[PDB]
Design a protein around this ligand. Structure first.
Ligand SMILES: OC[C@H]1O[C@H](O[C@H]2[C@H](O)[C@@H](O)[C@@](O)(O[C@H]3[C@H](O)[C@@H](O)[C@@H](O[C@H]4[C@H](O)[C@@H](O)[C@@H](O)O[C@@H]4CO)O[C@@H]3CO)O[C@@H]2CO)[C@H](O)[C@@H](O)[C@@H]1O
Length: 493
C-alpha cells in the first residue's frame, strides 16, 4: 500500500570509516570512498554519518581551525547523492570498542592537562583518562581564557560558518553534539584503556578535583558535610554483589548513596543541557536538527542495582527512570535522542552479564515517545546477519507498519555501524539491501524526506530552561509501549 507505506519509512544512515580524514587533516582516499558511497547510494541508503574530530580540526592552537579536508569530504558526499549526520566529536578515538585509528584531542589542550591533571575524568585510584574533558571544567576558564563549553561553542559556530553552503543546500540532516567519551553523554566508566572487560560493573569517574569539590559543597548544603565519594564500589571488573555499594541493602540505597547518585547523574543532565544551548545558538536558523548520543549499558540491567548504568551516570533503577529525564531535557532543544543496542537480543548475551538490551531499548524509546521527542539509534556492535537486521527493524517500528497511515510508533532514523569492505561483500551487502528495503517499508529510496514527513525547517531557539526538579519528575516509572515479538517486515533471508 504505496503512499501509506511511504508514511512508514524510516531512513537509514551508514557510518563512515574512522579516519576517513586522518590525524594530519588529510582526506586520504577520496577515490576509494567514492566507490563505496556510490554502492550505498545504489543500495538505497539515505545518508552517512561522520566524526568531525576536534583533535584534527583545532590542532594548531586555540581557534586555529582547518576545515579544508572536511569540505572535500562533504563535497564528495553531496556528489554521491547522500545526506550527512555530522558529529561534533570532542573526544578521542582509540581506546573504545572498535576504534582502529588513534585521534587524540588537541595537543594544546593536552599540554594544559600536563599542568592541570584534573581536566580529565579521574577514578578513585587516581588514573587520568585523556579521552574527554571532565564536566568539572565545563565552566572553568582555564583553556587560554576559555572554558570547555566555550571551546565547544566556538567550534560549532566555526563549523556552521565554514560549512554554510552545505548547510544551506540541505546536505546535513542533523548535528550530533558530542557530549563525552565516544561522543556519548556518559562518564568513561568502562575504559578498555584501564583494563575494563565486559561485563564488569565499571567505576565512578568523579574524583577529579573539580567534581570532588562540587560534590563536597553539595553534601554540605544537604547537611552532611562529612559525606565522601563512594569508597565501597569496587573496581572495573567486579560484579555488583562483591561490593558494599551495589550489594542488596548496600550503600546505593542509603541516603548518602542516593544523594551521590542523584548528584552524579545530574551533572550529565546539566552538561548536555548547557552544551545544547550553545549548539542551538551555533546552528540557529539552519535547516538541521540537533541530536545527542546515549550509550546502551545493557549489562546488569536485569539486577536491581543496575550497577553499570549507575557508574556510567544513568541513574536508572527498577523504580527510578534514569533516561526519561534525558528525553525531557532534549525536548526544549527540539533534539533527537540517538540510542544504541538496536540489533541486540538478550539471548545473545552471556547469562552472567544479567544483560537486558531488549528491555533497555524498549524503555529508552518509550520514554522519548512519552516525552514527545524524536528517537533514533544505532547498532552497538558490528553485525551482518539477518537476525540483527530483523531486530533493528522491530525496534524501528515496534508495533509494525500502519497500512492506513503513519505508524503510531516509529524511530526517526537508524545509523548503521559501519561502512567497511566486509559490508560490501556480495552476500553481506545483499542482506543489507533487504534491511534498507524493509526499513523503507518496501518502498524505493525516497530522495525528498518531505514525502515521508521528515521535512527540515530552520532550527528555532531553544525553549526556556527547565529546572532540575521538573526534569526529575520524569524519573517517575512508566509502563513501556508494547512491543511486537517479531517484526512484520522481516528481511526474508
Ligand atoms: O563513529 C561514531 C563513533 O563510533 C564509535 O562509538 C560508538 C560505539 O562503537 C558503539 O558501540 C555505540 O553504540 O556505544 C556504546 C554502546 O552503546 C554500549 O552498548 C557499549 O558497547 C558494549 C556492548 O554493548 C557490549 O555488548 C560489549 O561488547 O561491550 C561494549 C563496550 O566495549 O559501549 C559502546 C561504547 O560506548 O555508539 C558509539 C557512538 O556512535 C567510536 O568509539 C566513537 O569514537 C565514534 O565517535
Amino acid at each position: 500500500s504505496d503512499s501509506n507505506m511511504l508514511l512508514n519509512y524510516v531512513p537509514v544512515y551508514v557510518m563512515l570509516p574512522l579516519g576517513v580524514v586522518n590525524v594530519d587533516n588529510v582526506f586520504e582516499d577520496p577515490d576509494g570512498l567514492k566507490e563505496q558511497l556510490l554502492q550505498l547510494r545504489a543500495a538505497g541508503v539515505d545518508g552517512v554519518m561522520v566524526d568531525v574530530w576536534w583533535g584534527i580540526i583545532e590542532l594548531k592552537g586555540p581557534k586555529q581551525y582547518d576545515w579544508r579536508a572536511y569540505r572535500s569530504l562533504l563535497q564528495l558526499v553531496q556528489e554521491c547523492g547522500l545526506t550527512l549526520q555530522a558529529i561534533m566529536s570532542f573526544h578521542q578515538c582509540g581506546g573504545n570498542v572498535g576504534d582502529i585509528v588513534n585521534i587524540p584531542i588537541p595537543q594544546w589542550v593536552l599540554d594544559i592537562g600536563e599542568s592541570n591533571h584534573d581536566i580529565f575524568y579521574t577514578n578513585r585510584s587516581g588514573t587520568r583518562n585523556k579521552e574527554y574533558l571532565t564536566v568539572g571544567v565545563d565552566n572553568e576558564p582555564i583553556f587560554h581564557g576559555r572554558t570547555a563549553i566555550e571551546i565547544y561553542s566556538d567550534y560549532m559556530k566555526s563549523f556552521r560558518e565554514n560549512m554554510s553552503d552545505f548547510l544551506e543546500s540541505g546536505l546535513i540532516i542533523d548535528i550530533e553534539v558530542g557530549l563525552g567519551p565516544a561522543g556519548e553523554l556518559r562518564y568513561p566508566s568502562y575504559p578498555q584503556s584501564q583494563g575494563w572487560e565486559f561485563p564488569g560493573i565499571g567505576e565512578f569517574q568523579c574524583y577529579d578535583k573539580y567534581l570532588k569539590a562540587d560534590f563536597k559543597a553539595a553534601v554540605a548544603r544537604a547537611g552532611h558535610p562529612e559525606w565522601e565519594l563512594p569508597d565501597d564500589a569496587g573496581k572495573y571488573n567486579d560484579v555488583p554483589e562483591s561490593t558494599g555499594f551495589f550489594k542488596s541493602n548496600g550503600t546505593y540505597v542509603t541516603e548518602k548513596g542516593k544523594f551521590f547518585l542523584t548528584w552524579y547523574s545530574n551533572k550529565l543532565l546539566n552538561h548536555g543541557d548547557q552544551i545544547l544551548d550553545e549548539a542551538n545558538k551555533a546552528f540557529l536558523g539552519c535547516k538541521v536538527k540537533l541530536a545527542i548520543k546515549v550509550s546502551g549499558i545493557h549489562w546488569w540491567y536485569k539486577v536491581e542495582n543496575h550497577a553499570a548504568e549507575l557508574t556510567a551516570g544513568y541513574y536508572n533503577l527498577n523504580d527510578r527512570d534514569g533516561y526519561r529525564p534525558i528525553a525531557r531535557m532534549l525536548s526544549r532543544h527540539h533534539a533527537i535522542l540517538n540510542f544504541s543496542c538496536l540489533e541486540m537480543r538478550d539471548s545473545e548475551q552471556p547469562s552472567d552479564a544479567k544483560s537486558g538490551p531488549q528491555e533497555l531499548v524498549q524503555q529508552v524509546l518509550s520514554g522519548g515517545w512519552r516525552e514527545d521527542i524524536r528517537v533514533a539509534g544505532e547498532n552497538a556492535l558490528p553485525r551482518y546477519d539477518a537476525t540483527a537486521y530483523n531486530q533493528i527493524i522491530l525496534n524501528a517500528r515496534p508495533q509494525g507498519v500502519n497500512n492506513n497511515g503513519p505508524p503510531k510508533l516509529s524511530m526517526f532514523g537508524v545509523t548503521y555501524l559501519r561502512l567497511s569492505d566486509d559490508l560490501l561483500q556480495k552476500s553481506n551487502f545483499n542482506i543489507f539491501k533487504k534491511f534498507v528495503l524493509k526499513m523503507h517499508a518496501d518502498q524505493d529510496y525516497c530522495a525528498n524526506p518531505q514525502k515521508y514527513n521528515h521535512a527540515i525547517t530552520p532550527l528555532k531557539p531553544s525553549a526556556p530552561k527547565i529546572p532540575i526538579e521538573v526534569l526529575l519528575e520524569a524519573t517517575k516509572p512508566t509502563l513501556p509501549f508494547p512491543w511486537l515479538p517479531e517484526t512484520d517486515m522481516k528481511v526474508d533471508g
